[PDB]
Design a binder for this molecule. Sequence first.
Ligand code: NAG
Ligand code: NAG
Ligand code: NAG
Ligand code: NAG
Ligand code: NI
Ligand code: NI
Ligand code: ZN
Ligand code: ZN
Ligand code: ZN
Ligand code: ZN
Ligand code: ZN
Ligand code: ZN
Ligand code: ZN
Ligand code: ZN
Ligand code: ZN
Ligand code: ZN
Ligand code: ZN
Ligand code: ZN
Ligand code: ZN
Ligand code: ZN
Ligand code: ZN
Ligand code: ZN
Ligand code: ZN
Ligand code: ZN
Ligand code: ZN
Ligand code: ZN
Lengths: 184, 184, 206, 206
Amino acid sequence: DRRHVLLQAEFYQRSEGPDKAWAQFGFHFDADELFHVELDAAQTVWRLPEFGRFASFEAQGALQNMAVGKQNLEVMISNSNRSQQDFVTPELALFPAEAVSLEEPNVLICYADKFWPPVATMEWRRNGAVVSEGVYDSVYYGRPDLLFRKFSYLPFVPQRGDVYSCAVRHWGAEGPVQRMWEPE
Amino acid sequence: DRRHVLLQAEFYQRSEGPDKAWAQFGFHFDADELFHVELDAAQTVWRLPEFGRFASFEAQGALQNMAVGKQNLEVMISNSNRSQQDFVTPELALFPAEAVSLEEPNVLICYADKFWPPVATMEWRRNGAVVSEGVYDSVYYGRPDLLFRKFSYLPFVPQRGDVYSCAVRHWGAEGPVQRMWEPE
Amino acid sequence: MSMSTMNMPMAMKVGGGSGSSAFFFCGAIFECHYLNGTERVRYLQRYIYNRQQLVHFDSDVGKFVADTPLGEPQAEYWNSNAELLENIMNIADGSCRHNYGILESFTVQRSVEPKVRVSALQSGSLPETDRLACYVTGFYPPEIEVKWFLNGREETERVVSTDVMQNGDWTYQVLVVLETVPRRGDSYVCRVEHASLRQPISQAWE
Amino acid sequence: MSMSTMNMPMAMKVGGGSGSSAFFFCGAIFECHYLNGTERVRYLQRYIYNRQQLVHFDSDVGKFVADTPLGEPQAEYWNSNAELLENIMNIADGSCRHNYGILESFTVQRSVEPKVRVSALQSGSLPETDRLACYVTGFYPPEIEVKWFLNGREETERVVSTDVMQNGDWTYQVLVVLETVPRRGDSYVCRVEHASLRQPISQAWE
Ligand SMILES: CC(=O)N[C@@H]1[C@@H](O)[C@H](O)[C@@H](CO)O[C@H]1O
Ligand SMILES: CC(=O)N[C@@H]1[C@@H](O)[C@H](O)[C@@H](CO)O[C@H]1O
Ligand SMILES: *[C@@H]1O[C@H](CO)[C@@H](O)[C@H](O)[C@H]1NC(C)=O
Ligand SMILES: *[C@@H]1O[C@H](CO)[C@@H](O)[C@H](O)[C@H]1NC(C)=O
Ligand code: NI
Ligand code: NI
Ligand SMILES: [Zn+2]
Ligand SMILES: [Zn+2]
Ligand SMILES: [Zn+2]
Ligand SMILES: [Zn+2]
Ligand SMILES: [Zn+2]
Ligand SMILES: [Zn+2]
Ligand SMILES: [Zn+2]
Ligand SMILES: [Zn+2]
Ligand SMILES: [Zn+2]
Ligand SMILES: [Zn+2]
Ligand SMILES: [Zn+2]
Ligand SMILES: [Zn+2]
Ligand SMILES: [Zn+2]
Ligand SMILES: [Zn+2]
Ligand SMILES: [Zn+2]
Ligand SMILES: [Zn+2]
Ligand SMILES: [Zn+2]
Ligand SMILES: [Zn+2]
Ligand SMILES: [Zn+2]
Ligand SMILES: [Zn+2]
């Protein structure tokens, strides 16, 4: 039970038609995120802000890795003669953080798993209406099988008859994947 | 492990705005359906046609129960002063009958559970397009907690990249509950 | 032989009494509980309005019992009718025992063998961990024992079993996953015991 | 203290070479596997294009190894550069051990107690069966033992456990359900053992 893994994971990706570029740099411990760097702002963002009281990371190293990783992306695009792979659709889990009691505060978790590439937005609805107050979206966590996963969190106070949904729009997809959840 | 239950379960229901009436009469053994009567045609329909080689049921008894049950419904509507209850939304499970191998035939099962009242239609999609070839829809199975459940079956031969959905439209609902499933 | 209806048609008495959208539901359920085949049988009637049981009948008691106030008139009305109660006690003995005799051979004694597939995936996170899946399908009745063995010894820890799942067509399925770190020479075997099998099925991994 | 980056920026060599919609992905992963704290550490580099690992580096081997043909030029190119390989072996010892020293107290030694709720529902089908749920939430690390006891004796049969589920916020949850027919006088107790507890939690049903 006693092994642990620290991972520095980075990715650089781009789409044509439409044209868009993305980048991520994070540290991960076992299944959990330590931090990611906001590459625009050269800012380390700890997954739990208390981690920042015990350690620091200079984003300089991430800015250097981003530059070389974007160039390596163009090298692999040319050496592969622009070879591409099939997208893999997200699988959704939708569950509360805690034991549900009506009119007591809680957090609904939408977990998108086993998808590729790591581009996916979550949309929350309550009784068919879009809700977004206090929502937190995670960065993309890798898997040994080279697919990705992501978490979104909706703070909620449940009423009898509420119906919650999480919809995941994966890049290029003709429609979202969706899951519904009801209290009790 | 040795107890068994045989149930004769019947229900009579009606909606106003819009006006519609439904009726069901079935026998059930433990969690499974023995038969239901097609009340229009006075026909016993066995869940597995082979059951009909071992037993028979005359639908006359069901036609009599339907008549009295529809009258008892009006009595309870008047004695209760038209008392009504909140609808309970379906919870969906979506799983294949058998171990999936690409390009081998199988059956996807959409199980709608813990809903009330027992009025709910399943719609199947493959890659966003409606599919209905060979679909079987079950009648409504009761639960000790007075909620209902229903099964729908989609024959399929999976290709890499297929995305299946089952959508359940419950009576009166502003939108369907939905679940997606992908092979591998 | 022909199965018998497990009630006689019984009429409720109108007696309080009296925006636009509305829904009304009326259920009746008649149950034979076979506690030890036909040596011990409990017959129940249940009358339901919407999501509430108004009144029930227990063959062990022999009279209607109101569970809510909407059932109190009906219980008192039916309980004063010795013909109703005598007809119901005849069904509660005759019909349950008659229906059981017809059903026994293809329900109580239905036997469909499980099919067993063993496969493995790496988990979704490091440290490196294998998930050995024992997928068991197509069986009846739903009672089954599905256990993982490592080098002849039963594995307890890090075994996750789904519930036996109803397919709705008189067959059931279950998935039992062992999370493990394999070492070379290790022998992992899924063992499935079921009433339908003369001997257990043993399917080893790779 | 300040954590160190676990690679040095390394450039690939262009060398084959060359409808409208397109997607391209490039990943790099640097892993310190702590097999026995810092007494035994394996450092890996992985380079990925789309969904394929082109080339990796194992600190135990000390050279790049191509996994596909797209990685063979890069492996051969990097392997001829003693400065690259020496820099990488310095990180593989220094950085893994340095980062572990900083992280240990709030990761390896993070300890958050489980909360335990016991509840019961009737199953969705007769014969009458109770599902006793032991819901365990908010704990770290994910390793936990959750067992049902009937009258002081551990229940094995008809226990279904979900996997320990990741909440994604450094806490985990699990659900263990015992299917049972309760008899009067029966005492059912959920017992939870976890590194964070001085004594096991024992929560009885009703
Ligand atoms: C196979 C089977 O159903 N056996 C039961 C048995 O438990 C009981 O002893 C008997 C009463 O004589 O009723 C039978 O129906
Ligand atoms: C609490 C902890 O991490 N202990 C480990 C220990 O297994 C090992 O003996 C030691 C090497 O001297 O490395 C430590 O990091
Ligand atoms: C069930 O029925 C038989 C008689 O047919 C009886 O002798 C047996 O002991 C009963 N079993 C139980 C456990 O009550
Ligand atoms: C782990 O490290 C210690 C030394 O710090 C060693 O003595 C111990 O036996 C090692 N354990 C294993 C199981 O290799
Ligand atoms: Ni007879
Ligand atoms: Ni140091
Ligand atoms: Zn363009
Ligand atoms: Zn961020
Ligand atoms: Zn920014
Ligand atoms: Zn510091
Ligand atoms: Zn997609
Ligand atoms: Zn009208
Ligand atoms: Zn029909
Ligand atoms: Zn008809
Ligand atoms: Zn016949
Ligand atoms: Zn509804
Ligand atoms: Zn019973
Ligand atoms: Zn007895
Ligand atoms: Zn009673
Ligand atoms: Zn079960
Ligand atoms: Zn056999
Ligand atoms: Zn490892
Ligand atoms: Zn050692
Ligand atoms: Zn290697
Ligand atoms: Zn697990
Ligand atoms: Zn404690």
